[PDB]
Amino acid sequence: STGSATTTPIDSLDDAYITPVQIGTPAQTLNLDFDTGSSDLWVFSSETTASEVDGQTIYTPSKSTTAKLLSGATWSISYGDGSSSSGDVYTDTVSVGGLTVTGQAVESAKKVSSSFTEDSTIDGLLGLAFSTLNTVSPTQQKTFFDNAKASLDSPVFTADLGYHAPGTYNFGFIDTTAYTGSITYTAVSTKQGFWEWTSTGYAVGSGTFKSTSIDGIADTGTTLLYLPATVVSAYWAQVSGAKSSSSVGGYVFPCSATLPSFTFGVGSARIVIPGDYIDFGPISTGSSSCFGGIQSSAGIGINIFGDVALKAAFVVFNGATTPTLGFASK
């Protein structure tokens, strides 16, 4: 089997992407944030504290003839941005782009933190990291991809995120029309539960490539590109007036600037992020200070190849017995 679904930016900055997902019988369609940096499929629901729902579409398990309470199971998750959610668990039928999994754990939120409530466009998350990170207790649950893998034509999914435009998540096949050149594959460590790999270096604009190993994660659920402070300083030093602002929380730059591109290495191959992809717009409405798309990871503990980086490539998440990542230009 295969599946193919369109993923759409939630706003004019590409802050996140939502993909329609069918849950239950008859189908209830929710728009979920596919997140290769976490491993829980959780939704706003009829159980969510009413004051914490503000415009989202909810899953109502009592209206699904295929829903079953997973007795005793609870979940609770906290993300790198400080947001969180928790609740109980049902199993139900879940379909993405024509690909159906029966018995998928659907984690029903009883509580969500303010940033989730405040974002009316995201009805939940669909985790695509390794199932060892799933938070369900006392019996850990598998991701949608893990449950689907054996049925897929090939044990892979691909992320093709657009710049200010829709893109595609495919399951079970590699669309050879969706990229240019060849796909370069690189080793993955699953020891932390992430799609963790080592970039071979970077360049700023037309500058020379610096060969240096940068360990990080391919994370569709993080907006920006977080890299070591040395790399990020080298980038922003090429932008007149750019500076790190402790009050804003990162590098800002004059909105009048034209930004240089940023290249990262994948083996001997190179992925170029155009300068425009690094512009996240005014820090507050009407400001002439703009927020940068490349930021320091120094306070995180891990480097993160988020959407800013991933949207410049066609990315293969290869879930073969030994997982690997593939990157192609497009």
Active site residues: 35, 199
Cα separation, 283 vs 252, in Å, equals: 8
Per-residue tokens: 285: 């409405």
Cα separation, 174 vs 23, in Å, equals: 25
Helix (H, G, I), strand (E, B) or coil at 105: strand
CB atoms within 10 A of CB 283: 18
Per-residue tokens: 52: 């914490």
Query: Within 13 Å, how many C-alpha atoms sit on residue 234's CB side?
Result: 18
Of 62, 43, 63, 67, the C-alpha closest to 53 is 43
Cα separation, 168 vs 162, in Å, equals: 8
Cα separation, 298 vs 303, in Å, equals: 8
In angstroms, how far is CA 50 from the centroid of its own chain? 27
Long-range contacts of 173-176 (CB under 8 A, 24+ apart): 173/2, 174/316
